[PDB]
Enzyme design. Structure first.
Site, PDB file in Angstrom:
ATOM      1  N   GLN A  44     -14.050 -63.241 -31.624  1.00 19.46           N
ATOM      2  CA  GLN A  44     -14.615 -64.585 -31.578  1.00 19.46           C
ATOM      3  C   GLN A  44     -14.939 -65.205 -32.939  1.00 19.46           C
ATOM      4  O   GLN A  44     -15.356 -64.512 -33.866  1.00 19.46           O
ATOM      5  CB  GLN A  44     -15.829 -64.630 -30.662  1.00 19.46           C
ATOM      6  CG  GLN A  44     -15.438 -64.861 -29.217  1.00 19.46           C
ATOM      7  CD  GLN A  44     -16.621 -65.335 -28.435  1.00 19.46           C
ATOM      8  OE1 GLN A  44     -17.177 -64.596 -27.649  1.00 19.46           O
ATOM      9  NE2 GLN A  44     -17.073 -66.555 -28.684  1.00 19.46           N
TER      10      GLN A  44
ATOM     11  N   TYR B 187     -48.451 -25.684 -30.172  1.00 21.87           N
ATOM     12  CA  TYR B 187     -47.892 -25.120 -28.945  1.00 21.87           C
ATOM     13  C   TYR B 187     -46.416 -24.779 -29.161  1.00 21.87           C
ATOM     14  O   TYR B 187     -45.926 -23.792 -28.606  1.00 21.87           O
ATOM     15  CB  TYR B 187     -48.007 -26.121 -27.793  1.00 21.87           C
ATOM     16  CG  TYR B 187     -49.316 -26.086 -27.035  1.00 21.87           C
ATOM     17  CD1 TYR B 187     -49.777 -24.916 -26.444  1.00 21.87           C
ATOM     18  CD2 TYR B 187     -50.035 -27.259 -26.804  1.00 21.87           C
ATOM     19  CE1 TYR B 187     -50.954 -24.892 -25.699  1.00 21.87           C
ATOM     20  CE2 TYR B 187     -51.199 -27.253 -26.034  1.00 21.87           C
ATOM     21  CZ  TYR B 187     -51.664 -26.066 -25.498  1.00 21.87           C
ATOM     22  OH  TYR B 187     -52.820 -26.047 -24.752  1.00 21.87           O
TER      23      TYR B 187
ATOM     24  N   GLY C 211     -53.968 -25.226 -16.546  1.00 21.31           N
ATOM     25  CA  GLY C 211     -52.841 -25.269 -15.623  1.00 21.31           C
ATOM     26  C   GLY C 211     -51.514 -24.950 -16.259  1.00 21.31           C
TER      27      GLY C 211
ATOM     28  N   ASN D 276     -45.997 -29.152 -17.655  1.00 22.52           N
ATOM     29  CA  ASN D 276     -46.656 -28.276 -18.615  1.00 22.52           C
ATOM     30  C   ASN D 276     -45.841 -27.800 -19.814  1.00 22.52           C
ATOM     31  O   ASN D 276     -44.616 -27.704 -19.752  1.00 22.52           O
ATOM     32  CB  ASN D 276     -47.243 -27.076 -17.878  1.00 22.52           C
ATOM     33  CG  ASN D 276     -47.823 -27.449 -16.529  1.00 22.52           C
ATOM     34  OD1 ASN D 276     -47.355 -26.981 -15.485  1.00 22.52           O
ATOM     35  ND2 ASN D 276     -48.821 -28.332 -16.515  1.00 22.52           N
TER      36      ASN D 276
HETATM   37  C1  F43 Z   1     -13.766 -61.425 -25.403  1.00 26.11           C
HETATM   38  C2  F43 Z   1     -14.715 -62.328 -24.603  1.00 26.11           C
HETATM   39  C3  F43 Z   1     -14.672 -61.812 -23.167  1.00 26.11           C
HETATM   40  C4  F43 Z   1     -16.027 -61.188 -22.973  1.00 26.11           C
HETATM   41  O1  F43 Z   1     -16.268 -60.416 -22.058  1.00 26.11           O
HETATM   42  N1  F43 Z   1     -16.866 -61.572 -23.931  1.00 26.11           N
HETATM   43  C5  F43 Z   1     -16.208 -62.295 -25.016  1.00 26.11           C
HETATM   44  C6  F43 Z   1     -16.477 -61.715 -26.401  1.00 26.11           C
HETATM   45  C7  F43 Z   1     -17.940 -61.328 -26.547  1.00 26.11           C
HETATM   46  C8  F43 Z   1     -18.364 -60.678 -27.867  1.00 26.11           C
HETATM   47  C9  F43 Z   1     -17.569 -61.110 -29.104  1.00 26.11           C
HETATM   48  C10 F43 Z   1     -17.349 -59.877 -29.977  1.00 26.11           C
HETATM   49  C11 F43 Z   1     -16.385 -60.084 -31.119  1.00 26.11           C
HETATM   50  O2  F43 Z   1     -16.097 -61.230 -31.549  1.00 26.11           O
HETATM   51  O3  F43 Z   1     -15.920 -59.040 -31.611  1.00 26.11           O
HETATM   52  C12 F43 Z   1     -19.886 -60.915 -27.910  1.00 26.11           C
HETATM   53  C13 F43 Z   1     -20.498 -61.173 -29.292  1.00 26.11           C
HETATM   54  C14 F43 Z   1     -20.633 -59.743 -27.237  1.00 26.11           C
HETATM   55  C15 F43 Z   1     -20.410 -58.373 -27.879  1.00 26.11           C
HETATM   56  N2  F43 Z   1     -19.453 -57.677 -27.445  1.00 26.11           N
HETATM   57  O4  F43 Z   1     -21.147 -57.960 -28.767  1.00 26.11           O
HETATM   58  C16 F43 Z   1     -19.942 -62.188 -27.072  1.00 26.11           C
HETATM   59  N3  F43 Z   1     -18.822 -62.492 -26.550  1.00 26.11           N
HETATM   60 NI1  F43 Z   1     -18.342 -64.398 -25.936  1.00 26.11          NI
HETATM   61  N4  F43 Z   1     -19.911 -65.157 -26.992  1.00 26.11           N
HETATM   62  C17 F43 Z   1     -20.239 -66.442 -27.120  1.00 26.11           C
HETATM   63  C18 F43 Z   1     -19.761 -67.468 -26.386  1.00 26.11           C
HETATM   64  C19 F43 Z   1     -18.555 -67.431 -25.771  1.00 26.11           C
HETATM   65  C20 F43 Z   1     -17.774 -68.661 -25.359  1.00 26.11           C
HETATM   66  C21 F43 Z   1     -17.095 -69.294 -26.566  1.00 26.11           C
HETATM   67  C22 F43 Z   1     -16.587 -70.717 -26.302  1.00 26.11           C
HETATM   68  C23 F43 Z   1     -15.996 -71.309 -27.568  1.00 26.11           C
HETATM   69  O5  F43 Z   1     -15.395 -72.409 -27.496  1.00 26.11           O
HETATM   70  O6  F43 Z   1     -16.126 -70.683 -28.648  1.00 26.11           O
HETATM   71  C24 F43 Z   1     -16.749 -68.121 -24.375  1.00 26.11           C
HETATM   72  C25 F43 Z   1     -17.126 -68.452 -22.927  1.00 26.11           C
HETATM   73  C26 F43 Z   1     -16.817 -69.878 -22.521  1.00 26.11           C
HETATM   74  O7  F43 Z   1     -15.664 -70.343 -22.686  1.00 26.11           O
HETATM   75  O8  F43 Z   1     -17.746 -70.540 -22.012  1.00 26.11           O
HETATM   76  C27 F43 Z   1     -16.864 -66.646 -24.615  1.00 26.11           C
HETATM   77  C28 F43 Z   1     -15.991 -65.780 -24.093  1.00 26.11           C
HETATM   78  C29 F43 Z   1     -15.716 -64.448 -24.631  1.00 26.11           C
HETATM   79  N5  F43 Z   1     -16.623 -63.696 -25.062  1.00 26.11           N
HETATM   80  C30 F43 Z   1     -14.352 -63.817 -24.634  1.00 26.11           C
HETATM   81  C31 F43 Z   1     -13.608 -64.228 -25.908  1.00 26.11           C
HETATM   82  C32 F43 Z   1     -12.927 -65.588 -25.821  1.00 26.11           C
HETATM   83  C33 F43 Z   1     -12.084 -65.757 -27.061  1.00 26.11           C
HETATM   84  O9  F43 Z   1     -10.930 -65.279 -27.039  1.00 26.11           O
HETATM   85  O10 F43 Z   1     -12.571 -66.350 -28.056  1.00 26.11           O
HETATM   86  N6  F43 Z   1     -17.900 -66.317 -25.391  1.00 26.11           N
HETATM   87  C34 F43 Z   1     -20.627 -68.678 -26.315  1.00 26.11           C
HETATM   88  O11 F43 Z   1     -20.620 -69.445 -25.360  1.00 26.11           O
HETATM   89  C35 F43 Z   1     -21.574 -68.988 -27.456  1.00 26.11           C
HETATM   90  C36 F43 Z   1     -22.295 -67.709 -27.884  1.00 26.11           C
HETATM   91  C37 F43 Z   1     -21.294 -66.589 -28.195  1.00 26.11           C
HETATM   92  C38 F43 Z   1     -21.917 -65.195 -28.221  1.00 26.11           C
HETATM   93  C39 F43 Z   1     -22.412 -64.758 -29.597  1.00 26.11           C
HETATM   94  C40 F43 Z   1     -23.865 -65.064 -29.876  1.00 26.11           C
HETATM   95  O12 F43 Z   1     -24.577 -65.611 -29.002  1.00 26.11           O
HETATM   96  O13 F43 Z   1     -24.307 -64.765 -31.012  1.00 26.11           O
HETATM   97  C41 F43 Z   1     -20.766 -64.294 -27.789  1.00 26.11           C
HETATM   98  C42 F43 Z   1     -21.126 -63.112 -26.910  1.00 26.11           C
HETATM   99  O1  LIG Z   2     -58.437 -27.488 -21.367  1.00 22.69           O
HETATM  100  S1  LIG Z   2     -57.090 -27.741 -20.736  1.00 22.69           S
HETATM  101  O2  LIG Z   2     -56.445 -26.484 -20.240  1.00 22.69           O
HETATM  102  O3  LIG Z   2     -57.532 -28.602 -19.571  1.00 22.69           O
HETATM  103  C1  LIG Z   2     -55.975 -28.581 -21.838  1.00 22.69           C
HETATM  104  C2  LIG Z   2     -55.230 -27.612 -22.731  1.00 22.69           C
HETATM  105  S2  LIG Z   2     -54.495 -28.471 -24.094  1.00 22.69           S
HETATM  106  O1  LIG Z   3     -15.719 -64.640 -21.331  1.00 22.68           O
HETATM  107  S1  LIG Z   3     -16.926 -64.197 -20.544  1.00 22.68           S
HETATM  108  O2  LIG Z   3     -17.340 -65.477 -19.877  1.00 22.68           O
HETATM  109  O3  LIG Z   3     -16.515 -63.157 -19.531  1.00 22.68           O
HETATM  110  C1  LIG Z   3     -18.235 -63.573 -21.566  1.00 22.68           C
HETATM  111  C2  LIG Z   3     -18.912 -64.678 -22.343  1.00 22.68           C
HETATM  112  S2  LIG Z   3     -19.858 -63.940 -23.643  1.00 22.68           S
END
Ligand code: F43
Ligand SMILES: O=S(=O)(O)CCS
Ligand SMILES: O=S(=O)(O)CCS
Ligand SMILES: C[C@@H](OP(=O)(O)O)[C@H](NC(=O)CCCCCCS)C(=O)O
Ligand SMILES: [K+]
Lengths: 252, 443, 547, 548, 111
Positions: free
Chosen positions: D147, D332, D444, D480
């Site tokens: 990201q 202990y 105990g 214990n």
């Molecule tokens: C790989 C995933 C799938 C998943 O399960 N989580 C991810 C990635 C994960 C990683 C990114 C790790 C890295 O960069 O190495 C972390 C930081 C969590 C972690 N593993 O520590 C995170 N997202 Ni994501 N992720 C975010 C977000 C987002 C937004 C990004 C939208 C945009 O246009 O950039 C979209 C969801 C959406 O479309 O609504 C999103 C999806 C995604 N998020 C897509 C990656 C999409 C891509 O290819 O870029 N995150 C956010 O919505 C903002 C906060 C941001 C989080 C980091 C923080 O809060 O500091 C992070 C929260």
């Molecule tokens: O005196 S007691 O046996 O109750 C506690 C031991 S540390």
């Molecule tokens: O892309 S996912 O919506 O599954 C995770 C966002 S951090």
């Protein structure tokens, strides 16, 4: 019964209705060959056979299930092809297609759909064989996509809510697209053969086709119909959660 | 007869069985086969004699990759499965006429133990079945093979695993459909802790039977949880009948109408038409642009109809792709469309949609969950819908051609083999209809 | 003028209304001072870890394709780097959690009743002061009754102490100023009167165990550590038999019968003992924050609670305990940076004051629907008028959380009902979804789609006033951009009513204590101090490790 | 023969160890100790920082130092440290010992590779493995990979964090860089390495060590979750899959549930804790954490090193803090690994076993257990009788009972090779000790000892378990002190006699052989000596983000 | 009040906690319908009966009680009938030695 698809008085709501309506077939604003599509997708090279995850249904010894056999499987499920994707990042700046709009449209028009809505991305996972077909016939061809406002990206989808570049194109941290021409596949791997997607639509032209509410475009507060429906659903959910009786539902 | 509501009973094949049936004949509080299913689930344990034998021979006891060297015992347990079966029966039986049942499966490699109901009648919870069987097995093996005192703890470890150090069953060779009472997400969640894969394996991938089984269990749990008390009772009863027990052939007719070339949207249109036709819903107000805002006539019956349409939509969409992974998206957008098609609340007033939102997230991300079949009513991700989201998930795993890594063939081999042998478990809808016709006039 | 303008000024070189800019010309990661320190530190540490690879920006995503934004903490003039708001790099944030985790409240009345009723030993202020002087020696790890005992190094337990507080003013005056948390001296007269009226004539001990304990061990240790030493101090300060029948009563009172913990235990899937972030209800956290007694501004109070909440629940709890890795820093920052939520909450407050008045309207569906719609519409039009503001809150989840937070706070400003504000939040989410045809991430709205139904539900696992809801409430157990803002809505219901506390007055009194390392009166300013590395935390092992 | 505790007793006391007479109340009280003086001085210096609030004061309660305040010589070492420096709060090595265990998690990689090739169709090659391993060592300490606009964890706080790989398949091991691999052949002797690979099989495992700071700020339950997220992230980057699809959920399920190996399991409501807490660690797993087996052919040393690690973890950290708190249970535990007393008793027992039954020479029988346990206990209690100074060192009855029974149990395991036989021996030693001096331990101490004999060879659901699978959550052992640590010692003794490579889990044995760990698990006592002398440098310090 | 569920409800229940849940629900609906309690005030009725549930997996500040503790506070499997406080046995038997011994023994042995 004839479907209503979506509520709203404005043209924005009407564009959403047209997108959801399977009878409405929007104009082919661009023409991209299938071979170029398959390369952008990057799951296989054009000419490479379809990878199978499971044997064809015709060869499977399944027991009798009357209900199961009422559903005619799609072409991709019959041959047992692999489940692959295609993902779009739509600009909040008058893009013809939108995330929830896409999902609603796919669920209304196509069979065997697995779509995912997110703010910055919109994925669609299907059987590879029929997915390439639908990507080419609808997603690529129809008025749904704009090469400048709708970027095809599988990873590093950041840019949907960002300002446009000097040219007027949406941001791409991997510069997949640079005439609007893509140089790399959706993953990030550069293509040996670049692909021309055609012209881009100006902002003034996109206003009449976009499915997004914006102050500089069509404010949502102007569409009091949609607002009344949303407020209605919210109330119905609240009342239903409190007491699922007809007496309480008189407070709607 | 607390409710005026009548239902037409149709089977898995779509054939009519009986008309004008009171709704309460399907209630867990009246239906005898539902009572039998609960009672039997609580008293049945699946034993892996092959596993116990291999664990004792290798010394591989107490969980994943754990092996105790020098504590190996080579015992012909599978070979003597007959004598062990007879010993287990003798230890568990109270009177020579009770429901005590010990059956051998797959050439004596596996066993199916059923405690006498009376033992559970004097028990506060269901875990007794797992404990008594384990004890019956230890005594059976030790006495048959004259196992030494200093070696006997390995027999315990081979059967129960790392118990009592772990408050769960870790590396055990005995299983139940119900998880430990300590892993409960909330109070009265016990009957919800049944993996989707277990339902599918037991029903032998039969869509209608899996839907029926999951719905029966989920709705009986809604009664235990207190969510089916008072005004809410009629909602869950209509939910159970139309969504799980194919009331008025609604589910089947919707599948029949949209199986050919229908989509999720077409099913939504089909159910809205049927709902308007039966006077379950009506037009509230005609709005500008010609959109008609709809209002429910019968809130509970509307939810039941919508729930039936949800199962049908899953059968149609997941069936068209032959992939179980679609279910999470199907449940979501089925409910999302139906709300913006009519302006009416979705299944479980949005809870089914909310569950599907989280389900999609935890079946397509790094944070948790897994494949559709790995979920259950007691999972943190899929507990939100009150018995309306899990039965459609079961239908998706029934349909699946083999896209899933964590399939019931991998996760539910033992449980599948034991419970599919019982007639009521394998074909619940059939016996539930017969049970509804058994108490029909008695209510 | 909009409140985020003066904050967007140093962030962007262009006019906030500009829809265009240049990209791919910032030199990547090299544009940031923190990233440079990170790469340089990864080169310096390469030898000590062996040949094993470490932090490298060339791996994966090339950071810095866009103008990497710094962050200005709301209500403050502090502009910090983005990476300094990560809890792992912020000592103030760690100490905020450490101070909460090491806090435990024990009722002293029951223990004094054991002394008088059963043992016959009279309890006088003289014996209380002797007990309080003994506990401040035993609690940091000092011997009092046994010969040949080892002891904890005092330079590792300087942050450890035990104070006393009471609603009975006739008992308060007979205790040393050193040992007492004076309600009258710390709280305004009206708030102190409301607190003493809620507490009553009951004596409570607040024990703060050393930070090092919670660091080496866990939160479940705190109530146990306190209980042992309380038991010991009663044996010594009352010259009792060193182990008799009445001692067991002191143990039962201090560990079960009269104990007040920050957080409760959690179910098997997210198994944790008491005093973990998940067990802390929104009402209790709102009562930890002390902004209420230092400001008459209701919006400031609510937003300060939002700041503390979003950082604890999304960064520490959901970002580490429940997930881990890079975490959810940006998801939380959006709620307490660039005065964006401030602008939206102030607009809502001024809308409420005009149409209903603060606590002017009784909660009804029409009121909730009107306020929640207006605040959401303003919020989403602010993102539309400013492409730069939309660029700041790039993630849809951040926008939805902020818009719905202000919507909910505003409904609470008009009704004074936590559940009304909660219902307002859910409507804001549904409206936001139909506005931009997007909301948050893949599964951001599980609780929002279940929201409206469970907000005013009466069912066993659906019902609860928002004060009693928390990170263990079924719908709230998994996702970000909710928990912190819910604590804010909970504070907003009581801020409008000019209430001293929200759920527990003992928590409000306990955290008013100036002897705490973290300053709970100004959480945002304190996060700024931690980001600039001018915050000194406790629990460091410098007295026992080589230089 | 010559006794082993004399070298530490004569170096401790000015009088003859056999003399039952001495003078008291003439040492100047607490003033006699250098550490007590440092405590009273640091309490005076810090009195400014706390405000007017009182702090550490020796005038409160009992005047310490009426008795000769004893220092402590760690067994097998020439290090003589102060008593207060063996307290876990004042000892950095002890804290790092626990921190290293807590931050450890093992994940099976085979299932994840199967998802890639069978479902996704992406081929898994050693080239992709090395790339994955390069990516994880950037993501695990808190580095961004997919990201844009991501914040990052300061590398100076996560230098101790890394992820290594190990495998039983030698074809796969050679195809991996020496930097990323924990080589079983290079670290373990020939026999042991062969026994381990035979137990592991052709299975590839990842060992992830999360930064110490994480477990310090949060808890043990965070570790498996922290590892799982970054593992999931690395498969997305190093294989360039979609950043969130159906197959990703399978990686999460395998990393968090299906293929995960945790140090400790969860606990019931009364002592509620997540996984990776000391209470969830079984005796067999802890015996496999200690690496003395692969650096010494001495069976007694191996067992006693495990006793040292066990008594310190279970009685000092776990029962002394997590379950109680305050001053704790330092002495202990010290009694089990100081002044070579348990060494003398265990060596006598070993020499008695060798000259009568022979090591692993006798099959476990009641008569064998009864003979060995009686002899070792009688010797132990006669040593306290012949040496008033030794009895003065182990003043508490609990300490004496724990040491006497530990050596008794270890000896039975030296003769039988059965953990439960040694366990039965332990309980007989306790019953005998009670009738010898008409006293045992504290109020105990013998709950588990009186329930002992009955539950040692029981088959009942909550009574039965081989000692390897028993732990701090076993019903009788949940409360214990002076048992848990010695039980881990008896568990090691059963396998030390058999010359076994591991006791319960070979993956733990391989995972802790890693030289990249901060604490040296090969010599735990010598390392406790280094920590007591403040010569030990731990990880998880916030100096890079704290003002100087 | 003394509430006794019909045995049939327990016959279709996996555990005993149903009695606590159904009574709580029956009470909420009884109070809300009798006193015509407003929608926005009803959550307080739940809090007054069940306490801090579902945030706490136990009954914390609840005004309904059973002789049996929550299934989540079980020390081991099948321990449910052992979670009866000594004081509960003595209070129920009205301090009658033989009756209290009998009651405790019956429950402990059935367990
Ligand atoms: C790989 C995933 C799938 C998943 O399960 N989580 C991810 C990635 C994960 C990683 C990114 C790790 C890295 O960069 O190495 C972390 C930081 C969590 C972690 N593993 O520590 C995170 N997202 Ni994501 N992720 C975010 C977000 C987002 C937004 C990004 C939208 C945009 O246009 O950039 C979209 C969801 C959406 O479309 O609504 C999103 C999806 C995604 N998020 C897509 C990656 C999409 C891509 O290819 O870029 N995150 C956010 O919505 C903002 C906060 C941001 C989080 C980091 C923080 O809060 O500091 C992070 C929260
Ligand atoms: O005196 S007691 O046996 O109750 C506690 C031991 S540390
Ligand atoms: O892309 S996912 O919506 O599954 C995770 C966002 S951090
Ligand atoms: C679902 C569950 O994961 P499992 O399916 O049990 O592996 C659960 N996760 C979470 O709730 C993760 C919360 C933090 C990350 C998501 C933020 S949206 C947990 O780890 O206990
Ligand atoms: K910790």
């Amino acid at each position: 019964y004839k479907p209503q698809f979506y509520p709203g008085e404005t043209k924005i709501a009407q564009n959403r209705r047209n997108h959801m309506n399977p009878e409405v077939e929007l104009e082919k604003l661009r023409e991209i060959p299938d071979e170029d599509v398959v390369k952008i997708m990057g799951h296989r090279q054009p000419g490479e056979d379809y990878k199978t995850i499971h044997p064809p249904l015709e060869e499977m010894d399944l027991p009798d299930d009357y209900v199961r056999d009422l559903v005619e499987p799609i072409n991709g499920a019959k041959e047992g092809h692999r489940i692959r994707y295609i993902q779009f990042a739509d600009s909040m700046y008058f893009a013809p297609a939108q995330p929830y709009d896409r999902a609603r449209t796919y669920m209304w028009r196509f069979r065997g759909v697995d779509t995912g809505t997110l703010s910055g991305r919109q994925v669609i996972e299907m059987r590879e064989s029929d997915l390439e077909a639908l990507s080419k016939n609808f997603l690529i061809d129809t008025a749904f996509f704009d090469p400048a406002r709708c970027g095809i990206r599988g990873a590093t989808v950041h840019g949907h809510s960002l300002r446009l570049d000097e040219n007027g194109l949406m941001f791409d941290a991997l510069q997949r697209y640079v005439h609007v021409v893509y140089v790399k596949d959706q993953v990030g791997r550069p293509l040996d053969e670049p692909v021309d997607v055609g012209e881009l639509l100006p902002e003034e032209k996109l206003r009449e086709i976009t499915t997004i509410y914006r102050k500089d475009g069509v404010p949502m507060r102007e569409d009091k119909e949609l607002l009344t429906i949303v407020k209605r659903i919210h109330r119905a959910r609240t009342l239903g959660g409190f007491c699922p009786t007809e007496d309480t539902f008189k407070q709607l | 007869v607390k409710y005026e509501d009548k239902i037409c009973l149709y089977n898995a094949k779509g054939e009519l069985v009986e008309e004008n049936v009171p709704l309460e004949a399907i209630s867990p509080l009246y239906n005898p086969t539902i009572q039998k299913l609960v009672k039997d689930i609580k008293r049945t344990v699946a034993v892996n004699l092959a596993g116990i034998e291999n664990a004792l021979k290798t010394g591989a006891v107490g969980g994943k990759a754990c092996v105790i060297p020098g504590r190996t015992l080579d015992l012909p347990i599978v070979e003597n499965a007959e004598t062990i079966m007879e010993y287990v029966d003798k230890l568990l039986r109270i009177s020579p006429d009770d429901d005590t049942s010990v059956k051998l499966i797959n050439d004596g490699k596996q066993m199916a133990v059923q405690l006498p109901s009376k033992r559970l009648e004097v028990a506060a919870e269901y875990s007794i079945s797992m404990l008594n069987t384990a004890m019956a097995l230890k005594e059976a093996i030790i006495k048959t093979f004259d196992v030494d005192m200093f070696d006997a703890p390995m027999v315990h470890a081979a059967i129960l695993g790392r118990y009592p150090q772990v408050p769960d069953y870790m590396g055990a060779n005995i299983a139940s459909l119900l998880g430990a009472p300590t892993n409960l997400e909330g109070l009265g969640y016990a009957l919800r802790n049944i993996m989707v894969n277990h339902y599918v394996a037991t029903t032998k991938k039969n869509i209608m039977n899996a839907v029926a089984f999951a719905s029966i269990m989920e709705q009986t749990a809604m009664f235990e949880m207190g969510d089916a008390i008072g005004s809410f009772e009629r909602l869950h009863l209509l939910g159970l009948a139309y969504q799980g027990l194919n009331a008025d052939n609604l589910v089947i007719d919707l599948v029949k109408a949209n199986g050919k070339n229908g989509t999720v949207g077409t099913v939504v249109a089909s159910i809205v038409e049927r709902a308007l036709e039966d006077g379950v819903i009506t037009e509230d107000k005609k709005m500008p642009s010609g959109f008609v805002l709809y209002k429910p006539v019968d809130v509970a019956k509307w939810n039941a109809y919508a729930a039936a349409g949800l199962v049908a939509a899953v059968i149609v969409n997941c069936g068209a792709a032959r992939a179980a992974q679609n279910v999470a998206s199907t449940i979501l957008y089925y409910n999302d469309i139906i709300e913006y098609e009519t302006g009416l609340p979705g299944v479980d007033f949005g809870r089914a949609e909310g569950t599907a939102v989280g389900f999609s997230f935890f079946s397509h991300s790094i944070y948790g969950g897994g494949g559709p079949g790995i979920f259950n009513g007691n999972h943190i991700v899929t507990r939100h819908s009150k018995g309306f989201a899990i039965p459609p998930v079961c239908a998706a795993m029934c349909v699946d051609a083999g896209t899933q890594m964590f399939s019931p063939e991998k996760t539910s081999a033992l449980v599948g083999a034991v419970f599919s042998a019982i007639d009521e478990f394998r074909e619940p809808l059939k016996y539930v209809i017969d049970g509804a016709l058994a108490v029909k006039d008695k209510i | 003028k909009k409140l985020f303008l003066k904050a967007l000024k140093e962030k962007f070189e262009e006019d906030p209304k500009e829809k265009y800019t240049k990209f791919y010309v910032f030199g990547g990661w090299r544009q940031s001072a923190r990233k440079r320190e990170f790469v340089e530190a990864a080169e310096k540490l390469a030898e000590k870890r062996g040949g094993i690879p470490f932090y490298n920006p060339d791996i994966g995503v090339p950071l810095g394709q866009r103008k990497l934004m710094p962050y200005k903490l709301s209500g403050t003039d502090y502009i910090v780097e983005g990476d300094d708001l990560h809890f792992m790099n912020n000592a103030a944030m760690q100490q905020f959690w450490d101070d909460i985790r090491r806090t435990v409240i024990v009722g002293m009345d029951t223990a004094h009743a054991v002394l008088e009723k059963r043992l016959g030993v009279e309890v006088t202020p003289e014996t209380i002061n002797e007990y309080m002087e003994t506990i401040n020696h035993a609690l940091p790890g000092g011997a009092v009754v046994q010969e040949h005992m080892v002891e904890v190094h005092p330079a590792l337990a300087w942050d450890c102490y035990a104070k006393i507080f009471t609603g009975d003013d006739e008992l308060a005056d007979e205790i040393d100023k050193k040992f007492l948390i004076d309600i009258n001296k710390l709280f305004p007269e009206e708030q102190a009167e409301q607190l003493k009226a809620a507490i009553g004539k009951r004596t409570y001990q607040v024990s703060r165990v050393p930070t090092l304990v919670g660091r080496v061990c866990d939160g479940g240790t705190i109530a146990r550590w306190s209980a042992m030493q309380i038991g010991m101090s009663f044996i010594t300060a009352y010259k009792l038999c060193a182990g008799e029948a009445a001692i067991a009563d002191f143990s039962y009172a201090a560990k079960h019968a009269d104990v007040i913990q920050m957080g409760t235990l959690l179910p098997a899937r997210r198994a944790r003992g008491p005093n973990e972030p998940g067990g802390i209800p929104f009402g209790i956290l709102a009562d930890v924050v002390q902004t209420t007694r230092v400001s008459d501004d209701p919006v400031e109070q609510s937003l300060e609670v939002v700041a503390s909440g979003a950082m604890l629940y999304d960064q520490i709890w959901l970002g580490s305990y429940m997930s881990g890795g890079v975490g959810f820093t940006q998801y939380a920052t959006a709620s307490y940076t660039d005065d964006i939520l401030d602008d939206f909450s102030y607009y809502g407050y001024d809308y409420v004051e005009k149409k209903y008045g603060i606590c002017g309207a009784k909660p009804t569906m029409d009121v909730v629907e009107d306020i929640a719609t207006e605040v959401t519409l303003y919020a989403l039009e602010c993102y539309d008028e400013f492409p730069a503001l939309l660029e700041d809150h790039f993630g849809g989840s951040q926008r939805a959380a902020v818009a719905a937070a202000a919507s909910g706070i505003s409904v609470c400003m008009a009704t004074g009902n936590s559940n009304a504000g909660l219902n307002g939040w859910y409507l804001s989410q549904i409206l936001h979804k139909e506005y931009h045809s997007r909301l948050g991430f893949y599964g951001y709205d599980l609780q929002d789609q279940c929201g409206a139904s469970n907000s005013l539900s009466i069912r066993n696992d659906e019902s609860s006033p928002l004060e009693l809801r928390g990170p263990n409430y079924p719908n709230y157990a998994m996702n970000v951009g909710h928990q912190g803002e819910y604590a804010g809505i909970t504070q907003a219901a009581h801020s409008a009513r000019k209430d001293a506390f929200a759920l527990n007055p003992l928590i409000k009194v306990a955290f008013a204590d100036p002897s705490l390392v973290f300053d709970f009166s100004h959480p945002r300013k304190e996060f700024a101090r931690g980001a600039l590395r001018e915050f000194e935390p406790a629990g460091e092992r410098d007295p026992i490790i080589p230089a």
